[PDB]
């Protein structure tokens, strides 16, 4: 908790200034010209891979779209080239058959390859597998096992792919690591690299300015002073919101998300630590009524400021959207908050009854209590303009993509550890904790196949942009499972020059 | 409406800096030493008069208290000296008999005096008259008539006393005018004057900083953009709150008051101009319920943001006091807001029925609709720490001092002009508008006698500090009746050197 309010207010990055924003525009135009001159399809695919991994892809969206749309129209015997095209096309919603890998797979003896580069790209592409694509499953089985066996760069490349594949990491999180790798490359575009370093440093400056604003708001509520367990988690919460929506236009989305996660953290500590069962029933009822007079009349003292802070914050949230685009979402947003709170009470009742639920019964409640349903609702209302009534109702209908994404989120948090996923699974199968962890890791990978189908469904009310919020939340949980300061490195540490 | 958000943000007074605050402390100590050396009672009384009229009296409260407490223990044939002592002692709550003026009053022919200086001081003292003190009433009759008959400074002195006596003006409003008069004085204390100019300029800097903060809050709600009739009245509202509570420690009181008055102004325009009767019944009901879900469900579109802005603002107000001193005042503050709103609906129903009420029936509703009861409640909750439960309940009991102060406030606003006080009185007595205005001015002076009694009552739950909020609000209405830019001169125009 070193990065308190005073530290945040004292930051003064140079990259907020106007000179850098001029140079970035100059570089963007110069880069767009260089993209034109890449015409060979493999160079086109390697360019997109580099652009996405440098955190620059959102500047060149139509340019990337042309390249992929063109390659799809024309659609090797190269495993690297086949796997890279497969990954990129599936990532951006195009249909590619799993049968493109059939040439490298022998029916009797399985996959045949010795090239690490082709194996690494196939491993990345395997996470874009759909449900029931047995070639891709065997491809993952073959690639993971080969990668586990493992020149210094090959060892690190193999290590990173095993702990976190590209499909499971948000764009900006890998940006700093990949920026160095790109400057070590001999065939690097020098202007492309200079832009990657410049935009990365400018984003930090933007985030730091937002943190000052959010830091002052948190100080004004004074929950940290009132509640000794309300440790300042502001920077950690912003890290999550930043991974959910990193683009500069999503500043209001990151603000609502950061504050929401900070409040969620305090309320969660009240339910699964500090609150008695009778107190938790009153707080749940007060949230359900959404009546400030009732809450002040019946809540315990320590719960009052916590409820009122949440109450006013959400009502201000409803006011902001009402002013901005004349949309009333108060019923929706407080409904989602109640769902989270009710799932907390279910977990508290289980704990006091000493009831160990079956894993599936736990996951049914656990997918809501991990805030997946609430967070995607917050992200949609605070990050979309105009709000579409059809699209919001689809989220309120408990859709399948939210169902399975939240399950991965819940399973991933429990791996970092009331009884949770690991204890439920051990109790249910008799497996050891070590084995139980491996099976839970596998469930997440199998559930990502279900999620891949819903992303490709273009008949769903959810846009791809709305779906990215949900995936990035899940991706953020994968990332935070590896790292407990990387968050300090992401927000407060510029890249030199 | 020249002083918009952009003008307020661009101000950068030099007097916020630390050097001036050093010199002020040096001057305060040097002045306290000079006060010791004044020992003659008339010089002691003239010193207090100068200190109060320079806006410096709150720095030397115990020093003034000693002087008055000492003079009361020892308690001329000088009308000026008798009238000045009478005014100052009654102003600060000491008992002085009206019989101190009996020497200058002949039973058959009335008051005997030719000295303008003694007449001017008696005129000021006459406003501290109590109910039924026939000497003081005759003193006012004699002094006002003599003053009406009216060397350039005597004419201005006589003019100012007739339009606004000392008892009816807030301290800082007269400060700039009196500061010049004091520097023209030959026997001036030079350090006393330098302090008066310095504190006046420092207060402007403090107010300007508060205005920036309040200006940004008003911009964020966006009511001025939503409602074409919601003209920016922020600077005008702050002027009122500043006259209600000018001291630097009352920054939060001025903030809540300014925003409250800004919201009152918009809501008042909705009731007595723009809203239909059915719409006003829903808004009144929504305020009575204090239910955000109901309001969004049933209110017209244009009323929604106006209600929600008020709703969140008051709930944040309740939150701030709860965090600060663990006091719950939500029931009280929303009760006072409902009383104002209900009085608005009464006036709207009268207007649509074309019913001209009797003046007393109008004043019964009019004293609430002028916001007197609400404003004193806001001032107490936002300007007192700790809040006393006994003292608040006394305000909620509709006490007499609030009853008569609000009546003066209501009568004074109607003089600046649905049918109001002047039309009701004309309709009721057949008097002409010119005569009706004179009678209404007299009512206010007779009602100030009732208010003087309640101020002197030391058995009331209200402290003198709480009573000053109420009187300063009334005093502010007297001041704003004379001036429609004096408000610009008060806040944005420093005194040189
Ligand atoms: C300790 C924090 C949490 C709450 C996760 C924090 C990240 C969030 C992103 F949205 C919360 F919104 O883990 P947690 O174990 O305390 O949550 P849990 O009690 O249900 O298991
Ligand atoms: C035009 C403004 C008001 C409202 C007075 C503004 C000053 C205030 C100090 F507290 C309001 F809070 O006069 P007004 O004639 O419009 O009020 P009215 O309709 O009841 O007669
Ligand atoms: Mn927890
Ligand atoms: Mn929990
Ligand atoms: Mn957990
Ligand atoms: Mn009006
Ligand atoms: Mn009115
Ligand atoms: Mn009026």
PDB file of C-alpha atoms in Angstrom, chain B residues 49-255:
ATOM      1  CA  UNK B  49     -17.584  50.424  16.526  1.00  0.00           C
ATOM      2  CA  UNK B  50     -14.550  50.817  14.258  1.00  0.00           C
ATOM      3  CA  UNK B  51     -13.497  47.182  14.686  1.00  0.00           C
ATOM      4  CA  UNK B  52     -16.965  45.830  13.870  1.00  0.00           C
ATOM      5  CA  UNK B  53     -17.434  48.128  10.871  1.00  0.00           C
ATOM      6  CA  UNK B  54     -13.995  47.259   9.434  1.00  0.00           C
ATOM      7  CA  UNK B  55     -14.833  43.545   9.340  1.00  0.00           C
ATOM      8  CA  UNK B  56     -12.107  42.772  11.898  1.00  0.00           C
ATOM      9  CA  UNK B  57     -14.279  42.098  14.958  1.00  0.00           C
ATOM     10  CA  UNK B  58     -14.073  38.298  14.812  1.00  0.00           C
ATOM     11  CA  UNK B  59     -10.299  38.441  15.381  1.00  0.00           C
ATOM     12  CA  UNK B  60     -10.633  40.396  18.653  1.00  0.00           C
ATOM     13  CA  UNK B  61     -13.699  38.757  20.223  1.00  0.00           C
ATOM     14  CA  UNK B  62     -12.330  38.287  23.788  1.00  0.00           C
ATOM     15  CA  UNK B  63     -10.801  41.778  23.710  1.00  0.00           C
ATOM     16  CA  UNK B  64     -14.169  43.296  22.777  1.00  0.00           C
ATOM     17  CA  UNK B  65     -15.936  41.105  25.348  1.00  0.00           C
ATOM     18  CA  UNK B  66     -13.720  42.445  28.147  1.00  0.00           C
ATOM     19  CA  UNK B  67     -14.437  46.053  27.158  1.00  0.00           C
ATOM     20  CA  UNK B  68     -18.218  45.626  27.039  1.00  0.00           C
ATOM     21  CA  UNK B  69     -18.275  43.438  30.153  1.00  0.00           C
ATOM     22  CA  UNK B  70     -16.270  46.114  31.988  1.00  0.00           C
ATOM     23  CA  UNK B  71     -18.504  48.979  30.813  1.00  0.00           C
ATOM     24  CA  UNK B  72     -21.574  47.006  31.899  1.00  0.00           C
ATOM     25  CA  UNK B  73     -20.164  46.663  35.428  1.00  0.00           C
ATOM     26  CA  UNK B  74     -19.609  50.421  35.781  1.00  0.00           C
ATOM     27  CA  UNK B  75     -22.973  51.354  34.211  1.00  0.00           C
ATOM     28  CA  UNK B  76     -23.342  60.908  30.559  1.00  0.00           C
ATOM     29  CA  UNK B  77     -25.649  63.686  29.279  1.00  0.00           C
ATOM     30  CA  UNK B  78     -24.134  63.153  25.802  1.00  0.00           C
ATOM     31  CA  UNK B  79     -26.614  61.860  23.230  1.00  0.00           C
ATOM     32  CA  UNK B  80     -23.942  60.395  20.945  1.00  0.00           C
ATOM     33  CA  UNK B  81     -22.180  58.620  23.820  1.00  0.00           C
ATOM     34  CA  UNK B  82     -25.461  57.378  25.321  1.00  0.00           C
ATOM     35  CA  UNK B  83     -26.761  56.093  21.975  1.00  0.00           C
ATOM     36  CA  UNK B  84     -23.488  54.381  21.023  1.00  0.00           C
ATOM     37  CA  UNK B  85     -23.206  52.572  24.359  1.00  0.00           C
ATOM     38  CA  UNK B  86     -26.877  51.581  24.121  1.00  0.00           C
ATOM     39  CA  UNK B  87     -26.451  50.135  20.618  1.00  0.00           C
ATOM     40  CA  UNK B  88     -23.262  48.198  21.358  1.00  0.00           C
ATOM     41  CA  UNK B  89     -24.477  46.764  24.672  1.00  0.00           C
ATOM     42  CA  UNK B  90     -27.819  45.648  23.231  1.00  0.00           C
ATOM     43  CA  UNK B  91     -26.080  44.248  20.141  1.00  0.00           C
ATOM     44  CA  UNK B  92     -23.957  41.956  22.329  1.00  0.00           C
ATOM     45  CA  UNK B  93     -26.790  40.849  24.628  1.00  0.00           C
ATOM     46  CA  UNK B  94     -26.400  43.099  27.654  1.00  0.00           C
ATOM     47  CA  UNK B  95     -29.455  44.720  29.287  1.00  0.00           C
ATOM     48  CA  UNK B  96     -29.765  48.502  28.900  1.00  0.00           C
ATOM     49  CA  UNK B  97     -32.953  50.343  29.797  1.00  0.00           C
ATOM     50  CA  UNK B  98     -34.689  52.592  27.293  1.00  0.00           C
ATOM     51  CA  UNK B  99     -34.826  55.090  30.187  1.00  0.00           C
ATOM     52  CA  UNK B 100     -31.214  56.088  29.455  1.00  0.00           C
ATOM     53  CA  UNK B 101     -32.613  58.442  26.784  1.00  0.00           C
ATOM     54  CA  UNK B 102     -35.160  60.078  29.110  1.00  0.00           C
ATOM     55  CA  UNK B 103     -32.886  63.071  29.727  1.00  0.00           C
ATOM     56  CA  UNK B 104     -33.088  64.205  26.089  1.00  0.00           C
ATOM     57  CA  UNK B 105     -36.864  63.651  25.800  1.00  0.00           C
ATOM     58  CA  UNK B 106     -39.393  66.249  26.960  1.00  0.00           C
ATOM     59  CA  UNK B 107     -42.788  64.766  27.816  1.00  0.00           C
ATOM     60  CA  UNK B 108     -44.739  67.534  26.071  1.00  0.00           C
ATOM     61  CA  UNK B 109     -42.564  68.414  23.063  1.00  0.00           C
ATOM     62  CA  UNK B 110     -40.653  65.154  22.501  1.00  0.00           C
ATOM     63  CA  UNK B 111     -36.940  64.806  21.748  1.00  0.00           C
ATOM     64  CA  UNK B 112     -34.680  67.867  21.896  1.00  0.00           C
ATOM     65  CA  UNK B 113     -31.487  67.757  19.864  1.00  0.00           C
ATOM     66  CA  UNK B 114     -29.633  69.730  17.208  1.00  0.00           C
ATOM     67  CA  UNK B 115     -26.422  67.664  16.960  1.00  0.00           C
ATOM     68  CA  UNK B 116     -26.422  65.518  13.822  1.00  0.00           C
ATOM     69  CA  UNK B 117     -23.805  63.175  15.302  1.00  0.00           C
ATOM     70  CA  UNK B 118     -25.956  62.401  18.338  1.00  0.00           C
ATOM     71  CA  UNK B 119     -29.072  62.048  16.177  1.00  0.00           C
ATOM     72  CA  UNK B 120     -27.323  59.604  13.829  1.00  0.00           C
ATOM     73  CA  UNK B 121     -26.180  57.367  16.691  1.00  0.00           C
ATOM     74  CA  UNK B 122     -29.639  57.451  18.292  1.00  0.00           C
ATOM     75  CA  UNK B 123     -31.162  56.455  14.948  1.00  0.00           C
ATOM     76  CA  UNK B 124     -28.855  53.430  14.807  1.00  0.00           C
ATOM     77  CA  UNK B 125     -29.659  52.550  18.415  1.00  0.00           C
ATOM     78  CA  UNK B 126     -33.405  52.842  17.751  1.00  0.00           C
ATOM     79  CA  UNK B 127     -33.321  49.654  15.667  1.00  0.00           C
ATOM     80  CA  UNK B 128     -32.259  47.745  18.791  1.00  0.00           C
ATOM     81  CA  UNK B 129     -35.606  48.743  20.305  1.00  0.00           C
ATOM     82  CA  UNK B 130     -37.723  46.066  21.939  1.00  0.00           C
ATOM     83  CA  UNK B 131     -41.451  45.547  21.567  1.00  0.00           C
ATOM     84  CA  UNK B 132     -43.382  48.201  23.477  1.00  0.00           C
ATOM     85  CA  UNK B 133     -40.428  50.496  24.263  1.00  0.00           C
ATOM     86  CA  UNK B 134     -42.262  53.702  23.405  1.00  0.00           C
ATOM     87  CA  UNK B 135     -39.224  55.930  24.021  1.00  0.00           C
ATOM     88  CA  UNK B 136     -37.238  54.078  21.359  1.00  0.00           C
ATOM     89  CA  UNK B 137     -40.158  54.159  18.915  1.00  0.00           C
ATOM     90  CA  UNK B 138     -40.486  57.913  19.398  1.00  0.00           C
ATOM     91  CA  UNK B 139     -36.698  58.142  19.090  1.00  0.00           C
ATOM     92  CA  UNK B 140     -36.930  56.471  15.680  1.00  0.00           C
ATOM     93  CA  UNK B 141     -39.843  58.713  14.662  1.00  0.00           C
ATOM     94  CA  UNK B 142     -37.840  61.779  15.686  1.00  0.00           C
ATOM     95  CA  UNK B 143     -34.515  60.689  14.173  1.00  0.00           C
ATOM     96  CA  UNK B 144     -35.867  59.399  10.844  1.00  0.00           C
ATOM     97  CA  UNK B 145     -37.894  62.559  10.230  1.00  0.00           C
ATOM     98  CA  UNK B 146     -34.893  64.778  11.030  1.00  0.00           C
ATOM     99  CA  UNK B 147     -32.650  62.658   8.793  1.00  0.00           C
ATOM    100  CA  UNK B 148     -35.170  62.820   5.944  1.00  0.00           C
ATOM    101  CA  UNK B 149     -34.856  66.622   5.918  1.00  0.00           C
ATOM    102  CA  UNK B 150     -31.193  66.378   4.909  1.00  0.00           C
ATOM    103  CA  UNK B 151     -21.527  68.692   4.599  1.00  0.00           C
ATOM    104  CA  UNK B 152     -21.232  66.231   1.711  1.00  0.00           C
ATOM    105  CA  UNK B 153     -20.256  63.498   4.174  1.00  0.00           C
ATOM    106  CA  UNK B 154     -23.208  64.339   6.441  1.00  0.00           C
ATOM    107  CA  UNK B 155     -25.589  63.968   3.487  1.00  0.00           C
ATOM    108  CA  UNK B 156     -24.122  60.574   2.583  1.00  0.00           C
ATOM    109  CA  UNK B 157     -24.057  59.469   6.231  1.00  0.00           C
ATOM    110  CA  UNK B 158     -27.719  60.448   6.577  1.00  0.00           C
ATOM    111  CA  UNK B 159     -28.610  58.775   3.271  1.00  0.00           C
ATOM    112  CA  UNK B 160     -26.944  55.475   4.196  1.00  0.00           C
ATOM    113  CA  UNK B 161     -28.553  55.266   7.646  1.00  0.00           C
ATOM    114  CA  UNK B 162     -32.032  55.723   6.155  1.00  0.00           C
ATOM    115  CA  UNK B 163     -31.681  53.058   3.452  1.00  0.00           C
ATOM    116  CA  UNK B 164     -29.815  50.550   5.644  1.00  0.00           C
ATOM    117  CA  UNK B 165     -29.081  50.850   9.381  1.00  0.00           C
ATOM    118  CA  UNK B 166     -26.153  49.092  11.026  1.00  0.00           C
ATOM    119  CA  UNK B 167     -28.386  46.541  12.761  1.00  0.00           C
ATOM    120  CA  UNK B 168     -29.734  45.426   9.361  1.00  0.00           C
ATOM    121  CA  UNK B 169     -26.470  44.927   7.432  1.00  0.00           C
ATOM    122  CA  UNK B 170     -24.067  41.986   7.567  1.00  0.00           C
ATOM    123  CA  UNK B 171     -20.523  42.801   8.765  1.00  0.00           C
ATOM    124  CA  UNK B 172     -18.420  42.390   5.612  1.00  0.00           C
ATOM    125  CA  UNK B 173     -20.840  44.128   3.223  1.00  0.00           C
ATOM    126  CA  UNK B 174     -20.107  47.601   4.615  1.00  0.00           C
ATOM    127  CA  UNK B 175     -16.401  46.832   5.096  1.00  0.00           C
ATOM    128  CA  UNK B 176     -15.046  48.343   1.869  1.00  0.00           C
ATOM    129  CA  UNK B 177     -17.041  51.571   2.182  1.00  0.00           C
ATOM    130  CA  UNK B 178     -16.024  52.034   5.817  1.00  0.00           C
ATOM    131  CA  UNK B 179     -12.359  51.221   5.141  1.00  0.00           C
ATOM    132  CA  UNK B 180     -12.086  54.357   3.028  1.00  0.00           C
ATOM    133  CA  UNK B 181     -13.876  56.445   5.590  1.00  0.00           C
ATOM    134  CA  UNK B 182     -11.396  55.209   8.206  1.00  0.00           C
ATOM    135  CA  UNK B 183      -8.322  56.129   6.149  1.00  0.00           C
ATOM    136  CA  UNK B 184      -9.719  59.634   5.692  1.00  0.00           C
ATOM    137  CA  UNK B 185      -9.891  59.904   9.489  1.00  0.00           C
ATOM    138  CA  UNK B 186      -7.045  61.899  11.010  1.00  0.00           C
ATOM    139  CA  UNK B 187      -6.946  59.968  14.303  1.00  0.00           C
ATOM    140  CA  UNK B 188      -6.909  56.623  12.479  1.00  0.00           C
ATOM    141  CA  UNK B 189      -4.762  53.806  13.771  1.00  0.00           C
ATOM    142  CA  UNK B 190      -2.513  53.119  10.795  1.00  0.00           C
ATOM    143  CA  UNK B 191      -1.921  49.469  11.709  1.00  0.00           C
ATOM    144  CA  UNK B 192      -5.643  48.888  12.234  1.00  0.00           C
ATOM    145  CA  UNK B 193      -6.353  50.181   8.730  1.00  0.00           C
ATOM    146  CA  UNK B 194      -3.576  48.125   7.133  1.00  0.00           C
ATOM    147  CA  UNK B 195      -5.043  45.009   8.751  1.00  0.00           C
ATOM    148  CA  UNK B 196      -8.556  45.851   7.531  1.00  0.00           C
ATOM    149  CA  UNK B 197      -7.381  46.129   3.922  1.00  0.00           C
ATOM    150  CA  UNK B 198      -5.283  42.966   4.226  1.00  0.00           C
ATOM    151  CA  UNK B 199      -8.005  40.728   5.680  1.00  0.00           C
ATOM    152  CA  UNK B 200     -10.562  42.030   3.169  1.00  0.00           C
ATOM    153  CA  UNK B 201      -8.271  41.093   0.270  1.00  0.00           C
ATOM    154  CA  UNK B 202      -7.420  37.708   1.802  1.00  0.00           C
ATOM    155  CA  UNK B 203     -11.120  36.858   2.194  1.00  0.00           C
ATOM    156  CA  UNK B 204     -11.721  37.517  -1.516  1.00  0.00           C
ATOM    157  CA  UNK B 205      -8.933  35.075  -2.369  1.00  0.00           C
ATOM    158  CA  UNK B 206     -10.502  32.461  -0.078  1.00  0.00           C
ATOM    159  CA  UNK B 207     -13.946  32.994  -1.614  1.00  0.00           C
ATOM    160  CA  UNK B 208     -12.553  32.837  -5.155  1.00  0.00           C
ATOM    161  CA  UNK B 209     -10.976  29.449  -4.415  1.00  0.00           C
ATOM    162  CA  UNK B 210     -14.290  28.174  -3.046  1.00  0.00           C
ATOM    163  CA  UNK B 211     -16.109  29.479  -6.131  1.00  0.00           C
ATOM    164  CA  UNK B 212     -13.824  27.499  -8.450  1.00  0.00           C
ATOM    165  CA  UNK B 213     -14.709  24.337  -6.522  1.00  0.00           C
ATOM    166  CA  UNK B 214     -18.439  25.116  -6.485  1.00  0.00           C
ATOM    167  CA  UNK B 215     -18.295  26.231 -10.141  1.00  0.00           C
ATOM    168  CA  UNK B 216     -16.958  22.861 -11.280  1.00  0.00           C
ATOM    169  CA  UNK B 217     -19.628  21.003  -9.314  1.00  0.00           C
ATOM    170  CA  UNK B 218     -22.376  23.060 -10.966  1.00  0.00           C
ATOM    171  CA  UNK B 219     -20.913  22.420 -14.419  1.00  0.00           C
ATOM    172  CA  UNK B 220     -20.819  18.667 -13.760  1.00  0.00           C
ATOM    173  CA  UNK B 221     -24.555  18.429 -13.007  1.00  0.00           C
ATOM    174  CA  UNK B 222     -25.255  20.092 -16.354  1.00  0.00           C
ATOM    175  CA  UNK B 223     -28.645  21.493 -15.334  1.00  0.00           C
ATOM    176  CA  UNK B 224     -27.832  24.764 -17.095  1.00  0.00           C
ATOM    177  CA  UNK B 225     -27.411  22.830 -20.337  1.00  0.00           C
ATOM    178  CA  UNK B 226     -30.501  20.659 -19.839  1.00  0.00           C
ATOM    179  CA  UNK B 227     -32.861  23.477 -18.802  1.00  0.00           C
ATOM    180  CA  UNK B 228     -32.777  26.649 -20.888  1.00  0.00           C
ATOM    181  CA  UNK B 229     -34.229  28.610 -17.950  1.00  0.00           C
ATOM    182  CA  UNK B 230     -31.510  27.325 -15.588  1.00  0.00           C
ATOM    183  CA  UNK B 231     -29.347  30.395 -16.105  1.00  0.00           C
ATOM    184  CA  UNK B 232     -26.064  30.369 -14.184  1.00  0.00           C
ATOM    185  CA  UNK B 233     -26.894  32.043 -10.858  1.00  0.00           C
ATOM    186  CA  UNK B 234     -23.902  30.593  -9.009  1.00  0.00           C
ATOM    187  CA  UNK B 235     -22.122  33.855  -8.172  1.00  0.00           C
ATOM    188  CA  UNK B 236     -25.380  35.421  -6.977  1.00  0.00           C
ATOM    189  CA  UNK B 237     -26.125  32.414  -4.753  1.00  0.00           C
ATOM    190  CA  UNK B 238     -22.627  32.465  -3.244  1.00  0.00           C
ATOM    191  CA  UNK B 239     -23.127  36.145  -2.419  1.00  0.00           C
ATOM    192  CA  UNK B 240     -26.078  35.136  -0.231  1.00  0.00           C
ATOM    193  CA  UNK B 241     -24.247  32.279   1.509  1.00  0.00           C
ATOM    194  CA  UNK B 242     -21.264  34.592   2.041  1.00  0.00           C
ATOM    195  CA  UNK B 243     -23.474  37.137   3.781  1.00  0.00           C
ATOM    196  CA  UNK B 244     -25.035  34.347   5.848  1.00  0.00           C
ATOM    197  CA  UNK B 245     -21.649  32.997   6.995  1.00  0.00           C
ATOM    198  CA  UNK B 246     -18.546  34.930   5.944  1.00  0.00           C
ATOM    199  CA  UNK B 247     -15.884  33.494   8.295  1.00  0.00           C
ATOM    200  CA  UNK B 248     -13.177  31.290   6.652  1.00  0.00           C
ATOM    201  CA  UNK B 249     -14.048  28.320   8.889  1.00  0.00           C
ATOM    202  CA  UNK B 250     -17.526  28.224   7.321  1.00  0.00           C
ATOM    203  CA  UNK B 251     -16.267  27.119   3.889  1.00  0.00           C
ATOM    204  CA  UNK B 252     -18.388  23.960   3.914  1.00  0.00           C
ATOM    205  CA  UNK B 253     -21.417  25.956   5.080  1.00  0.00           C
ATOM    206  CA  UNK B 254     -21.011  28.377   2.171  1.00  0.00           C
ATOM    207  CA  UNK B 255     -20.629  25.435  -0.220  1.00  0.00           C
TER     208      UNK B 255
END
